[PDB]
Structure 1
Amino acid sequence: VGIRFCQECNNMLYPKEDKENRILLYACRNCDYQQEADNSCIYVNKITHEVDELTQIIADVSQDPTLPRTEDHPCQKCGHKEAVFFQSHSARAEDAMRLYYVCTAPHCGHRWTE
């Protein structure tokens, strides 16, 4: 779900309803500025949390000497043979030991799981 700030005081725009017209309006409080909402979903939260570590992996980890290198998995965006592989190893995890690979060649940063 998105986040909306006031265009007059830059504070949180909270959801609000006008029963007169039956539409969601994101209204600022202590400033009484209003905006026409469009998402129609004020709040969402995931429990199973099917989150992708590839979004959170950073290409610069190709420069880490402690990480292991492999030649068996060439890159896909440049074909570079050497890649650096590792595990997520965070919370929201410890259910998979799957490997995420980063293209070791500079100026590519192509990441992928297999």
Structure 2
Amino acid sequence: MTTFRFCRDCNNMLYPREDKENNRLLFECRTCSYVEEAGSPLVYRHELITNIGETAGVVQDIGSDPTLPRSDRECPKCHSRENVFFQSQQRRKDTSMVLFFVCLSCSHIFTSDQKNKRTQF
């Protein structure tokens, strides 16, 4: 959940700097003397068990992909029954076999995962 900042003048990357005196987070540039205050205090995250990428591929034309299986599940939003579906597109040994469905009318994505902790995808 990092977002990444660049110098307004150089477009080089910004690095963190503590404002020792007032106890605040700055990003500075190493190439200009530009600086700006930080948006959050999170500067680094490492997900060991990640979901980024389960849904990669979902694209306006997903339903013209003849190779994808189809089902008659209904979706939560449109109550339509035109889906395509696939497994997780992370390419792990340690993935579930859960399915991801894509509603072909309203483009809503949903899962067959009955322990869904996911909001987003």
Q: Is the structural similarity TM-score above 0.5?
A: yes
CA deviation after TM superposition for structure 1 residue 63, in Å: 1.6
CA distance in 2, matches of 1:89, 1:27: 37
CA deviation after TM superposition for structure 1 residue 92, in Å: 4.2
CA distance in 2, matches of 1:78, 1:40: 39
TM-score, with structure 2 as normaliser: 0.77
Structure 2 partner of 1:112: 110
% identical aligned pairs: 45
Q: Which runs of 4+ in 1 moved over 6 A?
A: none
Which letter maps to 2:26? L
Structure 1 partner of 2:43: 42
TM-score, with structure 1 as normaliser: 0.81
Structure 2 partner of 1:86: 86
CA deviation after TM superposition for structure 1 residue 9, in Å: 1.1
CA distance in 2, matches of 1:89, 1:53: 5
Alignment length (residue pairs): 110
- Larger C-alpha radius of gyration, 1 or 2? 1
- Unpaired runs of at least 5, structure 2: 113-121
Structure 2 partner of 1:75: 75
CA distance in 2, matches of 1:88, 1:39: 31
Aligned ranges 1:1-114 → 2 under 5 Å: 1-51=2-52, 53-54=54-55, 56-59=56-59, 60-71=61-72, 73-92=73-92, 94-105=94-105, 108-114=106-112
- Unpaired runs of at least 5, structure 1: none
Bigger fraction of residues in helix: 1
CA deviation after TM superposition for structure 1 residue 19, in Å: 1.9
CA deviation after TM superposition for structure 1 residue 99, in Å: 0.7
CA distance in 1, matches of 2:101, 2:13: 39
CA distance in 2, matches of 1:34, 1:101: 45
CA contact (8 A) 2:16 2:25 kept: yes
Which letter maps to 2:97? M
